[PDB]
Structure 1
Amino acid sequence: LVAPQNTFLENIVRRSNDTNFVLGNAQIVDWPIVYSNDGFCKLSGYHRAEVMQKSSACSFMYGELTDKDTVEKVRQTFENYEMNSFEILMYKKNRTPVWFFVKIAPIRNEQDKVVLFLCTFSDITAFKQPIEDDSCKGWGKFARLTRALTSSRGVLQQLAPSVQKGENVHKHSRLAEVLQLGSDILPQYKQEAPKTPPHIILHYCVFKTTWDWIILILTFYTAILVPYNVSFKTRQNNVAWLVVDSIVDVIFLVDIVLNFHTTFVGPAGEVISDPKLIRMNYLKTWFVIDLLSCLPYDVINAFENVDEGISSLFSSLKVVRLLRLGRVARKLDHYIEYGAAVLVLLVCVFGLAAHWMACIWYSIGDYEIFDEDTKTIRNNSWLYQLALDIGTPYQFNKWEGGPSKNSVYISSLYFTMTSLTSVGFGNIAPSTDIEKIFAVAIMMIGSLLYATIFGNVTTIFQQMYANTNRYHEMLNSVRDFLKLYQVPKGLSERVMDYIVSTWSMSRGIDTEKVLQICPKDMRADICVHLNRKVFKEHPAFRLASDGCLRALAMEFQTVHCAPGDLIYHAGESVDSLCFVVSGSLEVIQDDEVVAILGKGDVFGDVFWKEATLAQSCANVRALTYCDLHVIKRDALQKVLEFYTAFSHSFSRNLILTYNLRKRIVFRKISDVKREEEERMKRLPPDHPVRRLFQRFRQQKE
């Protein structure tokens, strides 16, 4: 998790080393200043706000002793863009002249251009010719001039008083710090990315992902095989297994070597890629135990071995991965995503634990069967009972071999496996004291791991089935509510269809919440993207600035209307302009169609001109599955009055397709036909209602 980062200011202030600097623009005439520094504003007495937007030729602290030659030199250096360093008499706020040195260094840009200048400053008043304009005394002016040379008199040239004729090196020492500014110019005012150092590879790379699986399977294989080899007294009649062990060991050696040149996630940070400390962290974390883990004791044992038991500790030596990789195998928890991979992990660890405890059961039995010099058969031991039951019992002339190692291994495996899973068949029995205590330990640990499996699997089931129950409960509650208040079917069907459709489409996601999660800039950009159709298609928005576009986009709300639903009823107040982006809409008046609406059409009223609310004169009904983009009247009015220049064109360019306030008058064909029929088949004393009609007409006039 890293971002392209601009490290201009930080590098320049770190490299300054108690100096000063002033920044200026490069593609701009006369070069106004873009930045100043505390050291400068303290030495020159000019505040930062009053130096801003000043010529970078430094004309504003010129004076009588300034040389026009130096002015031409700084001008040709600025216009030719070259490194250089001058000394020239400058003037402070009190117009007192003080000896001065300067050096300029423009900086390039990632786009192959020069954008910013950089001019550094220094005082050499105490080491130059003494010049005074108006002072109480010569020594007083000298002390005043020397008092401003603290930076030069500091550790930069602290050895000057102890020596003589040090001027031959003071200038070089002063210029050495300034000359380093090229290193700070490397970013070139650009989003310099944190490039990886050479011969170090990211740990998220494809090669490392495919290397992690192979090291996992190899460590799994070794963890299985080693105890069987070490305890079951197997011989080395097969040489190929030594070749396999050698290639296995060299693979682990390659892995431990590769772990040097690989970045790791810092626990106190995010990503650390500094080779001066990556290797140190690895060696202080896991490298020594991994080395003492990764020595071929058995391969050396092919010639000679210092100890026989070293190959036994070689097991737990290889097991250090099981934690080094196993806890990092939470990165293996990346995609096996159908149920938690912790389940595969627990079943695998159950298997390997069963193998381990089968091995140690065999070890116990072999340690128990014989009585050494006592020559006692010790018949109550489990292995002798198994030998009697399996057939081919022991005999003596020396003693017979009895059972073969293959059957003994699997029988011990069953004992362990029936012990761990707590079925306890009862054919092969612990019968002596140490088998007794072993059964104790095995049954304890098996019960614990059994409980762990159950807890994990139950958590999975409850997490998978959580959402379905809540949705069904909400639906049932809605159904009960509609049943209670005697709602007719014609409306209950509509409400349940709406609920089921909106749940199927939107799922368990809130658009408003997702919007409010993001910050203001991302929110505005998302709004622009969501509403981009209406801006880019409707000609009324082709003169929109970014600010007005964003202020409008923040407000627009989208509406999905099903077929048959109505938007604006007759008699309702109209207060929202709305653009049609999909489907088609119709307007019905007095049970007659007067207009039909399609894509890229808007209908409403001129709020900014009428400046008053009005009654809707007709109903608008949905035909097809349509999408609407609605704007409220108050917010639109506020935005348009804020953006007067935009409104002067918005009012002229925006034309409504149909005005809800305005309504048409008309007649019907059947009505005029029946009127004609009635007139073919064709009040004198109606004086009061005649006067009524006259009064009504006069009032209407």
Structure 2
Amino acid sequence: AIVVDPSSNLYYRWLTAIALPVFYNWYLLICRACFDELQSEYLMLWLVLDYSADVLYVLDVLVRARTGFLEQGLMVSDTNRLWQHYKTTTQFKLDVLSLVPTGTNYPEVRFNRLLKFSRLFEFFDRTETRTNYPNMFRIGNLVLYILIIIHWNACIYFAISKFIGFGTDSWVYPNISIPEHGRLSRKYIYSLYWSTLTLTTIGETPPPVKDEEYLFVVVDFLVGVLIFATIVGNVGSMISNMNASRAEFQAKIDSIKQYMQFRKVTKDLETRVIRWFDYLWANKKTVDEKEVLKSLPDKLKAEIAINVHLDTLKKVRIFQDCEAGLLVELVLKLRPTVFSPGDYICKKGDIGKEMYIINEGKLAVVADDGVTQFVVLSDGSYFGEISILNIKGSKSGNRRTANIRSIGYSDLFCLSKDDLMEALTEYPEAKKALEEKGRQILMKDN
């Protein structure tokens, strides 16, 4: 008695292996019931597939008898508790009603075993959770739903045509003693043609002449309108939903464009902000990080922010001798932005409110005017500590000591002043190391 868990991968493999016969039953039981040639021409194939479906249904009952459920956070493994919690509910009632045992020419007595629609929908929900292309999976799922609806209405039209009589009037399927319409391929593809032209509300089919045919075509048109237009609109919404993010970014661009065309901004600066939008779209840096993780807990958000920036944080002299909780809270507080080439990150004398850490950039410390590079700063270094942390032995306080220009497309980690002072409360050692680093670089520059 080994208890499987519903958050594993073997339970998902079982959900695939049991959503195969449920989809086989829901696709082909009404077809074998409504087309009389599929039941009698193929006879060993549906016997083999029905034996496989009944064996997999009995094994589905024996798996759901031993499927654990979370009580007070942890999984349970008491087999009698799992069997009693299973035996309580309507899913066990639907499984036993789907597995009653109920010559060999009627699958209409086998209509009780399409009652595992909950298991098929559980497979589709677990695949939509597990997959990497969820919007394409949702499009495939709703296309499967409208194909199931078109196939079921095709079989229902052929059953109503069989009940009224083949070829007695104009609306029904024609006379099946004729060798043209007598074939199973012609039967099924013409029933799919009538089903598509009824449910898509095209209606180029022959009109009804009898009252039961009028009632079925009215009910079929209304079912097609409501259910088919709802799922076709959901297909259109889910195709436009992946274009909506790029359309949001483009609508932001067009708002800034109509601002600059209203206010008559000059052409080289307009070209430079167009190049910034082209860089920001061609390097795929559009999704905001702490906004897209705005609901995660701080432990998983810190694990994500460490496993993104790991090659950057392994080079920093702060994060080689500091503490792990300080590292976690600082990478929770690091908000990155991207600078242009040839721009001042910091002026000569300014109010310093943040600290910058380099992350895949290349910037240099220029003089008071013009581009005369003193020291180039590659990735992994940092600057801003003199204007953030107040040096007691300085010639100036809360004023910056240098001019820094960015040579290329740099990406810096903005770490604000109050965030650093609330991060450096119980971690004095790294604060003292930054203090002596700022003191020695200020004793270099007086």
* Coarse TM-score class (shorter-chain normalised): 0.7 to 0.9
CA 451–546 in structure 1, closer or farther in 2 if over 3 Å, else same:
closer
What is the aligned counterpart of 1:456 among 222, 225, 234? 234
Candidates 209, 218, 229, aligned match of 1:431: 209
How far does residue 416 in structure 1 lie from its aligned partner after superposition? 4.3
Q: 1:610 aligns with which of 387, 394, 399?
A: 394
CA contact (8 A) 1:364 1:435 kept: no
Q: Supply the AA of the counterpart residue of 1:354.
A: N
Larger RCO, structures 1/2 (Cα 8 Å, 6+ apart) = 2
Structure 2 residue aligned with 1:278: 82
Match status 1:419 vs 2:419 = no
Question: Which AA in structure 1 matches 2:51?
Answer: I
C-alpha deviation, 1:364, in angstroms:
1.7
The separation in 2 between residues aligned to 1:638 and 1:651, in whole angstroms, is 16
Q: Secondary structure at the match of 2:405?
A: strand
For 2:345 and 2:416, the matched residues in 1 are separated by 14
The 1:358–1:276 alpha-carbon spacing in structure 2 relative to 1, beyond 3 Å, is: same
Look up the match of 1:244: 48
Residue from 342, 348, 359 that aligns with 2:147: 348
1:177-233 deviation per Cα after TM superposition (whole angstroms, max 9, x unaligned): xxxxxxxxxxxxxxxxxxxxx422234544443443343333333344434544555
> What CA deviation, in whole Å up to 9, does each residue of 1:20-40 have, x standing for no partner?
xxxxxxxxxxxxxxxxxxxxx
Query: How far apart are the structure 1 equivalents of 2:153 and 2:84?
Result: 38
In structure 2, the CA distance between the partners of 1:529 and 1:217, relative to structure 1 (3 Å rule), is: closer
Partner of 1:586: 365
Q: Which residue of 2 aligns with 1:122?
A: none
Q: How far 1:585 moved relative to its partner?
A: 0.5
Question: What is the root-mean-square deviation of aligned Cα atoms in Å?
Answer: 4.8
Aligned residue for 1:474? Answer: 252
Query: Whole-Å Cα distance in 1 between the matches of residues 418 and 196 of structure 2?
Result: 76
How many angstroms apart in 2 are the aligned matches of 1:289 and 1:515? 40
Q: Which amino acid aligns with 1:460?
A: M
Distance 2:66 2:353 in 1: 63
Native 8 Å contact 1:562 1:626 kept in 2: yes
Counterpart Cα distance in 2 of 1:408 and 1:533: 64
Secondary structure, aligned partner of 2:139? coil
Q: Calculate the TM-score normalised by the size of structure 2.
A: 0.73
Question: Where does 1:90-239 land on structure 2 (aligned, <5 Å)?
Answer: 198-230=1-33, 232=35, 236=40
Q: Percent identity?
A: 20
* 1:363–1:534 CA distance, 2 compared to 1 (3 A): closer
> 2: CA distance between counterparts of 1:625 and 1:259?
57
Partner amino acid, structure 1, of 2:55 = I
Q: Hey, what's the Cα distance between the residues in 1 that align with 2:72 and 2:315?
A: 51
User: Do the aligned residues in 1 keep the contact of 2:391 with 2:439 (CA within 8 Å)?
Assistant: no
Aligned length: 433
100, 109, 113: which one aligns with 1:313? 109
Match of 1:293 in 2: 98
Structure 1 residue 529, shift from structure 2 partner: 7.9
The DSSP-based 3-state class of the residue aligned with 1:607 is coil
- Of the three residues 323, 329, 332, the one matched with 2:124 is 329
1:623 is aligned with what amino acid?
I
Q: Deviations over 1:429-487 (max 9, x none)?
A: 54333333333332332232332233213322442332333322322222233334443
Larger gyration radius, structure 1 or structure 2 = 1
Tell me, what secondary structure is at the counterpart of 2:204? coil
Give the unaligned 5+ runs of structure 1.
1-197, 303-307, 370-378, 393-401, 663-701
Runs of 5+ consecutive residues of structure 2 not aligned to the other structure = none
Tell me the CA shift for residue 495 of structure 1.
3.3
- What is the TM-score when the length of structure 1 is the normalising length? 0.50
| Structure with higher helix content | 2
**In the alignment, is the contact (CA less than 8 A) between 1:563 and 1:625 conserved in 2?**
yes
Residue deviations 1:107-156 (CA, integer Å, cap 9, x gap): xxxxxxxxxxxxxxxxxxxxxxxxxxxxxxxxxxxxxxxxxxxxxxxxxx
Shift in Å, 1:320? 0.9
2:405 is the alignment partner of 1:621: yes
Please say if residues 602 and 656 of structure 1, whose CA atoms lie closer than 8 Å, have aligned partners that are also in contact.
Answer: no
Partner of 2:269: 491
Is the Cα–Cα contact under 8 Å of residues 139 and 239 in structure 2 kept in the other structure?
Answer: no
Residues 597, 458 of structure 1: alpha-carbon distance in 2 compared, 3 angstrom cutoff: closer
Q: Give the residue type in structure 2 aligned to 1:209.
A: Y
Kindly provide the CA deviation profile for residues 369-388 of structure 1, in whole angstroms up to 9, marking residues without a partner as x.
8xxxxxxxxx65866x9449
